[PDB]
RNA sequence: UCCAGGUCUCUCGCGAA
RNA sequence: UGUUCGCGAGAGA
RNA sequence: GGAG
């Protein structure tokens, strides 16, 4: 991915966009009860904690475009991945406007609790002024569709989130592309049935986990896998993606029947962006906030891995590849061991920078002990060993409970954290409840006992 | 003074028919 | 408690 | 930055 040009919106007539300059994150009641090292992300360029140039740092992810051509390995990847998906018998018809806007089996509605993007953002127009979920009215959307059309520019924001100390100072803040309501709608008309099919089929056929519940799904995953697992991390996955990857994705879509709308894929590959007082153009790179970015990045992951396997292990039978991606996150398996270290080197050839799974400083053997997916470990229940706990390390929970964007939400926030926390075991869970209840607000919260969670967990399998 | 800050998925909580 | 809808939040990608 |  690479910035083609950049210039101040003034020279071109695009309006300036102001994000709030301060974080909505404030220390919570439990700030001092738990240890933790993350703080609010750098949002502006005046920030004291900066030890480098902000804009330089945030746009640094656009490392360039390595390849431009679909080679034979990619083409074979394509064929294999397409052939897999054809077995799902995916409905290829357009999704109707009303279903696109207001959701249907497998695809939730548009979020009226979020920005409408360009150009509505420049007129104080919100989604709530256009959509109404109680009537499923499409009349004003259809008109607004005809008026502004599609392929509008994306508004770039800085994500307001916790961030590692190192990342704060080094200014490595993450960017959001706000997709236009128009484009979200047009995308869902074109691909909603694809989205639906994937959401209903988390697993090794889609090669995706979008639509799963980790509570339940974690017990399916080890059955789905092969004997030998492999995994790794990506560095700047989305922005590192070259246009060829977008061509191969089109090919897959042509293959499974979405051929008349692959042109939308071009709009993701070749995007224009408003950031504060600048307008810039990016060729390559998946924009983070477009419609289907979860589905598409995952699909593209399934193509990358097959391609590297073919490049690295000649003649490899891909029918035995069992992998599951969620965006750039992935857990893969083959009947015979595969060396992530070798794939990472082949990856360079295709513009991808691959590092060892979970920030380990060395490429080592992925096992059921140390593998992670969606930030959670795998741990069998001591009573019923075929039941697998998704286990998020307490540390992540600890970092979360220390901040809040609105103390109004304390009860709900902390309860949500308990639902994650208890898979760590009764000893750890009761300790967590202990530290929480060590402040008076803690004692005010209605918090689930371990026993309650375990029983409800077992019961949800039936 | 307020509002602002993407796409999705899952879950919990609340309100309704 | 089942569903179906609407709202809020948290987490993950 | 958007509306009062
Ligand atoms: Zn351009």
Reference A231, options A337, A382, A126; nearest CA is A337
User: Is residue A381 annotated as involved in ligand binding?
Assistant: no
Approach to solving = X-ray
Rounded to the nearest angstrom, the distance between the alpha carbon of A124 and the centre of ligand 1 is 26
Give dist(CA A224, CA A335) in Å, integer: 12
Domain A213-242+292-367 matches domain A375-462 at the CATH topology level: no
Report which DSSP code applies to A381: -
Cβ count within 10 A of residue A138: 20
Give dist(CA A143, CA A152) in Å, integer: 16
User: A92: helix, coil or strand?
Assistant: coil
Buried b (16+ CB within 10 A) or exposed e, A6-28: eeebeeeebeebeeeeebebeeb
Nearest nucleotide (C1') to alpha carbon of A123: D2
Which residues, in sequence order, are CB contacts of A369 under 8 Å at separation 6+? none
Give dist(CA A82, CA A293) in Å, integer: 18
Domain residues of chain A, as ranges?
1-13+70-202+243-284, 213-242+292-367, 375-462
Q: Are strands A270-275 and A154-158 parallel, antiparallel or unpaired?
A: parallel
Q: Is the dihedral of CA A133, A138, A143, A147 positive or negative?
A: positive
Q: Which residue has the tokens 């490392």?
A: A63
If one looks up domain A375-462 in CATH, what number appears?
Answer: 1.20.960.20
Structure tokens at A224: 């789905």
The CATH number, out of the four listed (3.30.70.270, 3.40.640.10, 3.40.50.150, 2.40.128.20), of the domain defined by the range A213-242+292-367: 3.30.70.270
Which residues, in sequence order, are CB contacts of A314 under 8 Å at separation 6+? none
User: A445: helix, coil or strand?
Assistant: coil
Closest residue (CA to C1') to nucleotide B7 in the complex: A289
Length of chain A (residues) = 462
Beta-bridge partner residues of A156: A177
Of the CA atoms within 13 Å of residue A68, those in its CB half-sphere come to 3
Evaluate whether A181 touches A130 at the Cβ level (below 8 Å): yes
Span CA (A157) to C1' (B3), Å: 17
Structure tokens at A443: 């004692």
In A242-293, the DSSP E strands lie at 270-275, 278-283
Reference A211, options A290, A107, A84, A296; nearest CA is A107
A99-103 contact pairs (CB < 8 A, 24+): A99/A192, A100/A185, A100/A188, A100/A189, A100/A192, A101/A131, A101/A136, A101/A138, A101/A141, A101/A185, A101/A188, A102/A131, A102/A133, A102/A136
Nearest nucleotide (C1') to alpha carbon of A200: B9
Which residues, in sequence order, are CB contacts of A296 under 8 Å at separation 6+? A249, A268, A286
Whole-Å CA distances, A439 to A33, A176, A370, A427, A454: 8, 36, 34, 20, 26
The protein footprint on chain D, as nucleotides within 7 A of a CB, is: 1-3
Reference A436, options A404, A398, A407; nearest CA is A398
User: Is residue A329 annotated as involved in ligand binding?
Assistant: no
Give dist(CA A39, CA A27) in Å, integer: 9
Percent helix, strand, coil in chain A, to 5, is: 45, 15, 40
Evaluate whether A19 touches A157 at the Cβ level (below 8 Å): yes
Contact, A211 CB vs strand B, < 7 Å: yes
Return the CA Rg of chain A.
23
Beta-bridge partner residues of A333: A229, A322
Give dist(CA A291, CA A272) in Å, integer: 15
Reference A185, options A135, A156, A134, A151; nearest CA is A151
> Resolution in angstroms for this experimental structure?
2.4
């Amino acid at each position: 991915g690479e910035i083609q040009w950049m210039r101040p919106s003034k020279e071109v007539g695009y309006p300036i966009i102001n994000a709030p300059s301060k974080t909505k994150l404030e220390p919570s009641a439990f700030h001092y009860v738990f240890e933790g090292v993350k703080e609010p992300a750098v949002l502006t360029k005046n920030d004291p904690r900066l030890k480098t140039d902000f804009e330089e740092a945030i746009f640094s992810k656009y490392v360039g475009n390595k390849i431009t051509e679909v080679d034979e390995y990619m083409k074979e990847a394509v064929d294999h991945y397409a052939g897999q998906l054809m077995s799902l018998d995916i409905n290829t018809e357009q999704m109707c406007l009303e279903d696109a806007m207001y959701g249907t089996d497998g695809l939730e509605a548009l979020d009226l609790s979020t920005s409408a993007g360009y150009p509505y953002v420049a007129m104080g127009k919100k989604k709530r002024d256009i959509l109404n979920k109680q009537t499923r009215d499409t009349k004003e959307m259809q008109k607004l569709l005809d008026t502004y059309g599609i392929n509008l520019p994306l508004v770039t924001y800085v994500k307001d989130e916790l961030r590692s100390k190192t990342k704060v100072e080094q200014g490595k803040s993450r960017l959001i592309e706000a997709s236009s309501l128009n484009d979200s709608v047009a995308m869902r008309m074109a691909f909603g049935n694809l989205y639906a099919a994937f959401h209903k089929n988390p697993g090794v056929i889609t090669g995706s986990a979008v639509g799963c519940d980790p509570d339940l799904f974690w017990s399916k995953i080890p059955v789905l896998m092969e004997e030998k697992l492999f995994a790794f991390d990506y560095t700047g996955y989305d922005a590192s993606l070259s246009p060829a990857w977008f061509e191969a994705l089109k090919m897959v879509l042509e293959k499974i029947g979405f051929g008349d709308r692959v042109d939308y894929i071009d709009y993701l590959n070749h995007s224009h962006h408003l950031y504060k007082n600048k307008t810039y153009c990016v060729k390559g790179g998946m924009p983070s906030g477009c419609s289907g970015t979860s589905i598409f990045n995952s699909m593209i992951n399934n193509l990358i891995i097959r391609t590297l396997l073919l490049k690295t292990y000649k003649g490899i039978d891909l029918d035995h590849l069992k992998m599951i991606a969620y965006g750039d996150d992935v857990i893969a398996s083959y009947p015979h061991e595969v060396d992530a270290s070798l794939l990472a080197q082949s990856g360079k050839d295709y513009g991808l920078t691959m590092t060892p799974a979970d920030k380990s400083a060395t490429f080592e053997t992925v096992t059921w002990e140390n593998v992670t997916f969606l930030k959670r470990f795998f741990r069998a229940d001591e009573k019923y060993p075929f039941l697998i706990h998704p286990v998020m390390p307490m540390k992540e929970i600890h970092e979360s409970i220390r901040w809040t964007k609105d103390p109004r939400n304390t009860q709900d926030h902390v309860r949500s954290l308990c639902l994650l926390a208890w898979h760590n075991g009764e000893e750890e869970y009761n300790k967590f409840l202990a530290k929480i209840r060590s402040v008076p607000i803690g004692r005010a919260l209605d918090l689930p006992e371990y026993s309650t969670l375990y029983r409800r967990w077992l019961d949800s399998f039936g």
